[PDB]
């Protein structure tokens, strides 16, 4: 299932796993959120974590694409390439994603505790 970037309304195939509502995010916006927020888990048509037996690598920056499946750096097929690079994350609509400037408010919403008056303000 695909959707429009919550900060761009551009079609995308990425949602942050650590986010509560997991909104659709363009590769640029998703990359900015993952590189800004502590959120290191991204949800796509398949989860990005290492597909090796026992291996539990979750940080997408540490993960590498391989034999039609994600891998960690240690468990890498001979020819591999890190997923997160060039200010974007590997996925669908990567070319057509536009990128906006709302990473600050999105990070604040995804990291606030709603206890203060900032959430309502």
């Amino acid at each position: 299932a695909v959707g429009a970037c919550v900060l761009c309304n551009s079609q995308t195939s990425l949602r942050c796993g650590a986010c509560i509502r997991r909104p659709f995010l363009c590769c640029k916006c998703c990359y900015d959120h993952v590189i800004s927020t502590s959120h290191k888990l991204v949800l796509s048509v398949n989860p990005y974590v290492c597909n090796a037996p026992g291996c539990d690598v979750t940080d997408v920056t540490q993960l590498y694409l391989g034999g039609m499946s994600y891998y960690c750096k240690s468990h890498k097929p001979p020819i591999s390439f890190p997923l997160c690079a060039n200010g974007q994350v590997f996925g669908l609509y990567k070319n057509t994603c536009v990128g906006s400037d709302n990473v600050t408010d999105f990070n604040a919403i995804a990291t606030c505790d709603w206890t203060n008056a900032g959430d309502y303000i």
Partner: protein, 186 residues
């Protein structure tokens, strides 16, 4: 793979060796440039190879889970795709009785059971008004599904046995509108 640093080193070696071979300087000079050429072609072709390889693995993953997404959405939408396709074939074929009953259902006149194929086997139709009666139910003769039927009993919503000749414009409001016509083929 023209915009590569390895491409740049290979081009520099190419230019220097071309100058040497055009000017004809010496033997060891061209050997040095040929060494450099072998080195430059080595790390300019090996990296071109594995970068195009990574490019086509990227394409493989793209097309793979692209097909995955297409399959999932298709199996989500089958439940309406089938109906649309069926209606398209229907409005393409257009048998006379088919369109007749289609329109009768469209205005709200449908059979309550399966249409039989013999002069016997009473079939029940629900007609919720009196205009369609004039359109279809003329006296005891009911022309439905491109066939003639003799009306044998009409009943209203409150199960009151409705007489044939009693039905008229003036008394039409004083009659339970969802009438049921039970008829046999003629």
């Amino acid at each position: 793979f023209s915009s590569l640093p390895s491409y740049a080193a290979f081009a520099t070696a190419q230019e220097a060796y071309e100058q040497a071979v055009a000017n004809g300087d010496s033997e060891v000079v061209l050997k040095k440039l040929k060494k450099s050429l072998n080195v430059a072609k080595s790390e300019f072709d090996r990296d071109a190879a594995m970068q195009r390889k990574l490019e086509k693995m990227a394409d493989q993953a793209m097309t793979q889970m692209y097909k995955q997404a297409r399959s999932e959405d298709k199996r989500a939408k089958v439940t309406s795709a089938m109906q649309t396709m069926l209606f398209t074939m229907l409005r393409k074929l257009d048998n006379d009785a088919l369109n007749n009953i289609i329109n009768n259902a469209r205005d709200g006149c449908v059979p309550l059971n399966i249409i039989p194929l013999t002069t016997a086997a009473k079939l029940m139709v629900v007609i919720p008004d009196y205009n369609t009666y004039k359109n279809t139910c003329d006296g005891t003769t009911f022309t439905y599904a491109s066939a003639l039927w003799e009306i044998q009993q009409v009943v209203d919503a409150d199960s009151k046995i409705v007489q044939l000749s009693e039905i008229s414009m003036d008394n039409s409001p004083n009659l339970a509108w969802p009438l049921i016509v039970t008829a046999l083929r003629a």
